[PDB]
Design a binder for this molecule. Sequence first.
Ligand SMILES: *[C@H](C)[C@H]1/C(=C/c2[nH]c(/C=C3N=C(/C=C4\NC(=O)C(CC)=C4C)C(C)=C\3CCC(=O)O)c(CCC(=O)O)c2C)NC(=O)[C@@H]1C
Ligand SMILES: *[C@H](C)[C@H]1/C(=C/c2[nH]c(/C=C3N=C(/C=C4\NC(=O)C(CC)=C4C)C(C)=C\3CCC(=O)O)c(CCC(=O)O)c2C)NC(=O)[C@@H]1C
Ligand SMILES: *[C@H](C)[C@H]1/C(=C/c2[nH]c(/C=C3N=C(/C=C4\NC(=O)C(CC)=C4C)C(C)=C\3CCC(=O)O)c(CCC(=O)O)c2C)NC(=O)[C@@H]1C
Ligand SMILES: *[C@H](C)[C@H]1/C(=C/c2[nH]c(/C=C3N=C(/C=C4\NC(=O)C(CC)=C4C)C(C)=C\3CCC(=O)O)c(CCC(=O)O)c2C)NC(=O)[C@@H]1C
Ligand SMILES: *[C@H](C)[C@H]1/C(=C/c2[nH]c(/C=C3N=C(/C=C4\NC(=O)C(CC)=C4C)C(C)=C\3CCC(=O)O)c(CCC(=O)O)c2C)NC(=O)[C@@H]1C
Ligand SMILES: *[C@H](C)[C@H]1/C(=C/c2[nH]c(/C=C3N=C(/C=C4\NC(=O)C(CC)=C4C)C(C)=C\3CCC(=O)O)c(CCC(=O)O)c2C)NC(=O)[C@@H]1C
Ligand SMILES: *[C@H](C)[C@H]1/C(=C/c2[nH]c(/C=C3N=C(/C=C4\NC(=O)C(CC)=C4C)C(C)=C\3CCC(=O)O)c(CCC(=O)O)c2C)NC(=O)[C@@H]1C
Ligand SMILES: CCC1=C(C)/C(=C/C2=NC(=C\c3[nH]c(/C=C4\NC(=O)[C@H](C)[C@H]4CC)c(C)c3CCC(=O)O)/C(CCC(=O)O)=C2C)NC1=O
Ligand SMILES: CCC1=C(C)/C(=C/C2=NC(=C\c3[nH]c(/C=C4\NC(=O)[C@H](C)[C@H]4CC)c(C)c3CCC(=O)O)/C(CCC(=O)O)=C2C)NC1=O
Lengths: 161, 161, 161, 161, 161, 49, 160, 160, 160, 160, 160
Amino acid sequence: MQDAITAVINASDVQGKYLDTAAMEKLKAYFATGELRVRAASVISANAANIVKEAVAKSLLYSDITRPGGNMYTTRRYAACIRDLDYYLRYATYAMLAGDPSILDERVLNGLKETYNSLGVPIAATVQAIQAMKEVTASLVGADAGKEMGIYFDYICSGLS
Amino acid sequence: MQDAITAVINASDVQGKYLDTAAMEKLKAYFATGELRVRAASVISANAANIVKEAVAKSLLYSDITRPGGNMYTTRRYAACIRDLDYYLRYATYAMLAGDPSILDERVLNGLKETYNSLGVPIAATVQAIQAMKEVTASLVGADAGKEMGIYFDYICSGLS
Amino acid sequence: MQDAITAVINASDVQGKYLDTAAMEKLKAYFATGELRVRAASVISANAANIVKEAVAKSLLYSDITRPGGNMYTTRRYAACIRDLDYYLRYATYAMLAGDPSILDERVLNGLKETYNSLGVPIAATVQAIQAMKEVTASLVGADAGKEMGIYFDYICSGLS
Amino acid sequence: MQDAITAVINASDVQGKYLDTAAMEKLKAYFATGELRVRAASVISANAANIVKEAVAKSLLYSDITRPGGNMYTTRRYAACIRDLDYYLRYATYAMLAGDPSILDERVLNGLKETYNSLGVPIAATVQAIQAMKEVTASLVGADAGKEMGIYFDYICSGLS
Amino acid sequence: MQDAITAVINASDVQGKYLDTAAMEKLKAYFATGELRVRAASVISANAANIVKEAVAKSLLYSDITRPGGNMYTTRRYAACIRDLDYYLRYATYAMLAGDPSILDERVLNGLKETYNSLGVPIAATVQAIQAMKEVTASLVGADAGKEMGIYFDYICSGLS
Amino acid sequence: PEKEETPRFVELGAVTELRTEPAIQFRANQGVSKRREQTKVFKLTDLND
Amino acid sequence: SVVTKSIVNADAEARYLSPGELDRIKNFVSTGERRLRIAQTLTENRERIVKQAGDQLFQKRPDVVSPGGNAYGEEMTATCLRDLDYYLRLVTYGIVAGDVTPIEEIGLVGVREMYNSLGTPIPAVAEGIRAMKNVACSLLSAEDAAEAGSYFDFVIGAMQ
Amino acid sequence: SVVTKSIVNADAEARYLSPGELDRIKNFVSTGERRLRIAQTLTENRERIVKQAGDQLFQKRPDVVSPGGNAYGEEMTATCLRDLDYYLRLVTYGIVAGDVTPIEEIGLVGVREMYNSLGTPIPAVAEGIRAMKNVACSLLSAEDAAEAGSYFDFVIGAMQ
Amino acid sequence: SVVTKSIVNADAEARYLSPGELDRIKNFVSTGERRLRIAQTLTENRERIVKQAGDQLFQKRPDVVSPGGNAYGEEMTATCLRDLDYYLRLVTYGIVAGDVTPIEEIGLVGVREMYNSLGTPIPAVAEGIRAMKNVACSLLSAEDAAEAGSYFDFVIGAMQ
Amino acid sequence: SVVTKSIVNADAEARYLSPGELDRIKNFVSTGERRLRIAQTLTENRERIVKQAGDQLFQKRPDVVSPGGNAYGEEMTATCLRDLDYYLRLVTYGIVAGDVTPIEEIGLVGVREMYNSLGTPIPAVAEGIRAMKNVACSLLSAEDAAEAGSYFDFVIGAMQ
Amino acid sequence: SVVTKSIVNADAEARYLSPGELDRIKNFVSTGERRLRIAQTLTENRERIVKQAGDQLFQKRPDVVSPGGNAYGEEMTATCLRDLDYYLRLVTYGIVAGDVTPIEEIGLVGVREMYNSLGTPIPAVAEGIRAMKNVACSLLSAEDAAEAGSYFDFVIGAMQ
Ligand SMILES: *[C@H](C)[C@H]1/C(=C/c2[nH]c(/C=C3N=C(/C=C4\NC(=O)C(CC)=C4C)C(C)=C\3CCC(=O)O)c(CCC(=O)O)c2C)NC(=O)[C@@H]1C
Ligand SMILES: *[C@H](C)[C@H]1/C(=C/c2[nH]c(/C=C3N=C(/C=C4\NC(=O)C(CC)=C4C)C(C)=C\3CCC(=O)O)c(CCC(=O)O)c2C)NC(=O)[C@@H]1C
Ligand SMILES: *[C@H](C)[C@H]1/C(=C/c2[nH]c(/C=C3N=C(/C=C4\NC(=O)C(CC)=C4C)C(C)=C\3CCC(=O)O)c(CCC(=O)O)c2C)NC(=O)[C@@H]1C
Ligand SMILES: *[C@H](C)[C@H]1/C(=C/c2[nH]c(/C=C3N=C(/C=C4\NC(=O)C(CC)=C4C)C(C)=C\3CCC(=O)O)c(CCC(=O)O)c2C)NC(=O)[C@@H]1C
Ligand SMILES: *[C@H](C)[C@H]1/C(=C/c2[nH]c(/C=C3N=C(/C=C4\NC(=O)C(CC)=C4C)C(C)=C\3CCC(=O)O)c(CCC(=O)O)c2C)NC(=O)[C@@H]1C
Ligand SMILES: *[C@H](C)[C@H]1/C(=C/c2[nH]c(/C=C3N=C(/C=C4\NC(=O)C(CC)=C4C)C(C)=C\3CCC(=O)O)c(CCC(=O)O)c2C)NC(=O)[C@@H]1C
Ligand SMILES: *[C@H](C)[C@H]1/C(=C/c2[nH]c(/C=C3N=C(/C=C4\NC(=O)C(CC)=C4C)C(C)=C\3CCC(=O)O)c(CCC(=O)O)c2C)NC(=O)[C@@H]1C
Ligand SMILES: CCC1=C(C)/C(=C/C2=NC(=C\c3[nH]c(/C=C4\NC(=O)[C@H](C)[C@H]4CC)c(C)c3CCC(=O)O)/C(CCC(=O)O)=C2C)NC1=O
Ligand SMILES: CCC1=C(C)/C(=C/C2=NC(=C\c3[nH]c(/C=C4\NC(=O)[C@H](C)[C@H]4CC)c(C)c3CCC(=O)O)/C(CCC(=O)O)=C2C)NC1=O
């Protein structure tokens, strides 16, 4: 796991130099946006169930995927699908709070492609679904916060793809 | 005439309850503060003439009220004023000892405003005199029992108002 | 067997010091409280039979325990049960007079657990009974002495349980 | 394990009552002393090894115990002795931070005397060593915090006895 | 500054109580020691210069410190070293007569360590020299006087290091 | 006057035994050991951390 | 109370409390803690006193509880025992207050009229209060029991 | 509480409290006075909160107090309100503790198992606690209300 | 202690404490402050009593400090002086307690066995304790000296 | 102490203690016992000495204790006696010290400013110290009075 | 950082950030100004902190710079001051981060292994960092010094 402060000080550490005024400026900028990041996290924490529900309904439901033989069919499969969407949204809010994509890159994305391909889970459908989550969560948090979140959602989409 | 002790027991009697823990706490408070009340009563008893004298001086003497055509003019009227001021002091001391303003209500204030309005006695000047006594007696008895006295002096002031 | 005084001097003896001023303060406190202890003992010694009677009636009677096959059924066992209750009350007042629970642990609760398990006596029913004794004896001796009898009764309860 | 706040609320919970005014008193007192506790913990966390070092030197070194045949002799047993002192100091700082000795009884002093007797460790010598620790740690933290550390070091001593 | 008598007087003033028996015997101990103190002080003044010479000869003379680049390898540096040693000796003789370390704390040991450090003069070298001076002084003064002079000089050496 | 009685729900959930320190010490620490919830469990969730 | 007694006597003569009056108040407030304790024992044991004294009254005066008597059946015996509880409560008020004025105002002025209207036998009521006095003495310590006994004695005298 | 959680987490790793934990407990210590104030308000208005929140709950769930419902009749409705009173008491404990550990252990481990044994509906208990949260927030200031409302929120979340 | 002795005897008799035994406990309680002061002056003058009495003992019994005696050698003499300090300590305990129970339990029971193994003559130990009694008597008033002297008397009698 | 004053002078002089200065220190050592005895007498007769002095001072200047005076009233008169007692204790300290060093740091530096702020009369305080000097001369030996009078006299001069 | 550590714990227990954790994140971000100011002071005075504290270390532990020691020679002493420079840099990083995980991640995991491989004395490194902390106290105001002191405390504590 890494964050904005950790990234700045890590870059300075690789440089072998004390915190420069430019590095302090980068830290100040992250501090400036940390306020908005906190309230966005609170909002989607409360509405996380609604967000997953809305995205699943928007793209996943009333389809051959959840119809028999579509791999989302079976109650266990449906629970696993919404569980993965919960995972993606929770890790997205962690990355949004941190201001860094490290958590997604290491905790989530690695090996996920291999497991999904081995199991037969449709990565295209997952990407579509988390795209729908991104739209819903942007509406709830607001525009500025949605910009902050959407990059991490797209990062996860690229990892799946 | 009803003390704080008689008030506590009478309230419990009205409710038909034995003296409970809360009312017994009230009684413990009164019993504890009784020593201060008693000593202050002795102080006011000894210095009654001085308290009245200083109050009459601080608020009433050398003014329209004492000059001819005012109420306190004529020795008759002046003697009546100092008599009534001592009555207000003596009953306030009774009330401090008891812990209840009921003695003031039943014996003093039971028509006082009507009597003063009938005779033409200035209610504002009487209030000023009683507040002057409040100051002087606070000095004599000390602040701790001065506050306890002050509530009953304020009671008389409010009634006459 | 120990007392409050004996415990204080024994602690100082273990350290090997003559009675320190802190030890003297403990001893002085016990002396100050001794009269209150003597009064409370005088009270419950007179009412010992009544305390046992009320506790038995409140918790042990008109239940299966004192009806055929209940461990208090049979006159021999009923006599034994009330005798144990007087045992508990007598040793509790010994401990109250001493100001130390060493009496209870050394005498009352040495293997009392084991005896009752062997005999088939219900530990829980005995604990309920002495709880009722605690309520009655606290009311008789008053609040401050009752909270002193209470701790010793609860110590007996804990040993049984 | 408990702390001052947990102990207060647990006692109130046992008696089935909302937090009393006396319970609120204890909570306030802990909060008033809490910042002092935190500062002291920081100090002896930094100097933990040094405190053990000084105490070992001041009572456990150049003595018959560390000479052959005295239990502390042998490098194994020396390492075990200093490790036990670090255990005692660390659990003392836990107890001081919590404001309750329940940690000491629950995790340190339960069975400790039995194990020490079986091992042959001198309970008297360990008590002397931790009293030396008490002096050193009191000097480092300060007088006020040193008192607080002492009431838990002495608790450990009494358990060892 | 302070004396033995003055310090006992200060403690009595802190307590707020007139001279106690304990105060009397503490003062009487100083009164008894006075003869030894004054005789030793005369001896110390008589052999003061010889004491300095003996101490440096025993400790730092004919060493690398005296040899080039040793912080004493100049005429000015050597004179300064002798001067500081004489300063410590004179204040220590004062303090020995006084019976209290307040004089040494107030004047001798105020910022001395920091100044020595920044200069680069070795604190350990000074401490060794002070101990050598203590040995010479004890020999000259006598056994009883040497014990007291040792205490005062020990304060100076410990404060320096 | 106002009757000022206690509500029934106060009485139903009120313990009327006047418990003291030995009883509270025992009745608060009754049950399975508190180290069932006062512990920690360690996992090798990420080899990289 | 005793504070009210002092203040009433002072008010009648239009004088600040005399030093003797104030002495009495100081004694009463100093003794208040023991007074409250005595009253508290009676209140805490309010059920024992009434129950045992009720049994003693019914033994000594069986006619009241017999059929055809005033307190026949549990419905009416409950009211009789309630009145015994009333007078215990008045006595506790009196112990706290330091005077018999609480007792006399609440429950002794016109007992003859009230009970003679209800048909109740007043001498039997007096026996009940005397039984309460004896039971209370068992509960209380001797020095304290003497003080509480005085208030019980005032009640029995009033109903004789 | 925060202090005991930090000590537990540190004891498992055998580490003296790191500065990261020490500042946490220092923060909790500093805000302790506000926490005690919130709890004091709740315990003062214990009876009002329970009474009117229970009335709201019965208004939103008439089936619960209707005949055949779990809390039907005088005593049964009083036990339902007693449970609400218990949860309010746990909430005050949690507020002063500064974490949800007392609430969790005392009353949310196996709450579903207990209520299903009783036959009580867990969602209706949740709505009762929601009504309590609304009333308690009305008795607190905005900052004080939102700090306590989270403990209420944890309780209702576990109820669901 | 008076309390422990009374309760021991009552335990054997299986009786709640007799009124007379309670009266003795009352009087012991009231006299406790005088006992504490007597013990206080003894411990304050601990040093003078030990050294003065020990020198008296050695004068009375030069054999013990002679070569071929038990205490010959400064170290052995010092440990005997310690024994005298021990017994004074036990006597102070006994004065506070009010009975010999602490004195006899802590020491003075297996006294002959211990001292026979040590080689000391126990009558010589008794002589030392007698000297301590004399010095303590001088340091006490006539009343106070009588109370402390009784405990010293028990100790010397048991030594013999 | 006198030694302390000599040490201060020596430290300013940057020289070891002068032979004559050491001689005065030797004299102070010799007079330690006599000075301690005089101080013990003053402390023993402390209450009576300052009681008589207070009566004499109030007689000399009745406006200190009269209405409108600084010490008018019992409490303020007791405070005035305390100030005198502070001075008496300082004089005893100074007699033990053998020098004005103890008093000067306590009650002789800025004392005029403090007394002016509170309102007490500095000349009347000085007279009170003089009354103490007379009482002390009465209660001490002739040469003891001379030395004690000298220390008292420095205090009186400081008040001026 | 505080943010990353809170996220890590929430990640482990599979919970979105709790409201209190969100408050802590917000607070740390807001006080970041003070954090940066403290770090700016330390980097402004990197030269004297290292130089003065290292000289104090050499004086306190002469054996490290003695012949046949780890720091003998100007080349080795330059590297030693370089190490102190590295640790001060880590401390400034930690102050900026608000947590000690950057300090631990960079320079406290395996210090014993590295320094023992080099032959350097680990306790001596700890004492040098203690010297840096003492130098820091003067440079930073009392309130500021406590904040930086905790990071210094972690470094020395891990070092020992
Ligand atoms: C039924 C008596 C109650 C009820 C149900 C309800 N369900 C849905 C939607 C879905 N239900 C399923 C269920 C299953 N999928 C499975 O694989 C299996 C096992 C073989 C089951 C049981 C699924 C997948 C859906 C999603 C839609 C879909 O099938 O694609 C709805 C519609 C919800 C909506 O608003 O979209 C409803 C209403 N509703 C009730 O009132 C009953 C109490
Ligand atoms: C003079 C012979 C003596 C004396 C008197 C003195 N009197 C006062 C104050 C007042 N005197 C009066 C008197 C009257 N009021 C009336 O209505 C009548 C009848 C018509 C009389 C005689 C009053 C009212 C006052 C109060 C002040 C005022 O008039 O408002 C003082 C002043 C006292 C003070 O400090 O208040 C004095 C000095 N003094 C002497 O030495 C003579 C022996
Ligand atoms: C003095 C502060 C002021 C004042 C008063 C004044 N009062 C009267 C006359 C009477 N006062 C009363 C009042 C009371 N009767 C009571 O029972 C009590 C409480 C115990 C009180 C206070 C009554 C009934 C009278 C009339 C009978 C009488 O004269 O006593 C007068 C005289 C008026 C007259 O016409 O004779 C005066 C002047 N006067 C002032 O100037 C002051 C401001
Ligand atoms: C009836 C002839 C007399 C009488 C008796 C009376 N007894 C009780 C209560 C109890 N009686 C027993 C008796 C026994 N327990 C046994 O194990 C045996 C041997 C098999 C016997 C005989 C017990 C245990 C009780 C306690 C209550 C209970 O059983 O739970 C009462 C009730 C007392 C009360 O007020 O509670 C009475 C009245 N009473 C008479 O008037 C007759 C002369
Ligand atoms: C030696 C070549 C180096 C050195 C050592 C040094 N050691 C100590 C102190 C102690 N050493 C031991 C060692 C052992 N105890 C054991 O049981 C065993 C195995 C049988 C060993 C090896 C102990 C116990 C001590 C403590 C003192 C004591 O014995 O009581 C010191 C003294 C430390 C101090 O300041 O107190 C020293 C100096 N020192 C060197 O310079 C060498 C490189
Ligand atoms: C040092 C002051 C004294 C001393 C100690 C010594 N202790 C042991 C062995 C053990 N000590 C413990 C104690 C604890 N275990 C814990 O987990 C905690 C904290 C919760 C404590 C306090 C235990 C369990 C052991 C045995 C297992 C082990 O070896 O760790 C020894 C070793 C004895 C042996 O020979 O096996 C020693 C020497 N020794 C001294 O001389 C000091 C007086
Ligand atoms: C219910 C009638 C009474 C009661 C019980 C109670 N039990 C526990 C805890 C435990 N009980 C057992 C017993 C068994 N284990 C078994 O395998 C079997 C069947 C073969 C039994 C009967 C055990 C092992 C435990 C501890 C482990 C656990 O957590 O269950 C508790 C305490 C629970 C806790 O502390 O968290 C309680 C309260 N309590 C009552 O009031 C009834 C009288
Ligand atoms: C860089 C400037 C500098 C100088 C010059 C210097 C001199 C110096 N001369 C010394 C000794 C000495 N110096 C003399 C000097 C003399 N005796 C005689 O008869 C002659 C007249 C005369 C020289 C011609 C003697 C005799 C000693 C030895 C003293 C002793 O220990 O007995 C010592 C003490 C011993 C030592 O070195 O540890 C120093 C330090 N130190 C310095 O730092
Ligand atoms: C509070 C009383 C007080 C103290 C303690 C004090 C110490 C003091 N010592 C100093 C220097 C010094 N001190 C020494 C002393 C020594 N040389 C050695 O070899 C020994 C290890 C050691 C003592 C025996 C030396 C060599 C200097 C520097 C002299 C120079 O090079 O200019 C200086 C710098 C100014 C100077 O050069 O004199 C001060 C202020 N000054 C004071 O007012």
